[PDB]
């Protein structure tokens, strides 16, 4: 019947929308890889920043190294 043939033709009318739904599915699996790569980036540029900023991103945990040199002058 022509009615049946019409519904079969229309079954694939929303190709473009289904490709967009594919985009979402794949990008949701891939986007978490930004965290490992992000930690390493900050890890690399941390020593090139000022001392004042290095103590802020760590909540006062980080401090200058104490190796026993360059102490105050009497």
């Amino acid at each position: 019947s022509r009615a049946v043939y019409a519904k079969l033709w229309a079954s694939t009318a929303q190709y473009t929308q289904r490709r967009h739904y594919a985009w979402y599915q794949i990008w949701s699996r891939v986007i978490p890889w930004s965290v490992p790569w992000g930690i390493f980036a900050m890890w690399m540029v941390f020593p090139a920043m000022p001392v004042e900023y290095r103590q802020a991103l760590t909540f006062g945990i980080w401090q200058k190294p104490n190796i026993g040199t360059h102490g105050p002058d009497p």
Binding site: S1, A3, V4, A6, K7, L8, S11, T12, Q14, Y15
Partner: peptide
């Protein structure tokens, strides 16, 4: 003794109304 066949006549129907009877079908 052949069986007695019932008649089913041809009828013209509105296409849009017959589409309300097609089973649901999804490909996507």
């Amino acid at each position: 003794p052949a069986p007695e066949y019932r008649r089913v006549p041809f009828v013209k129907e509105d296409m849009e109304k017959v589409m309300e009877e097609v089973p649901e079908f999804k490909y996507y």
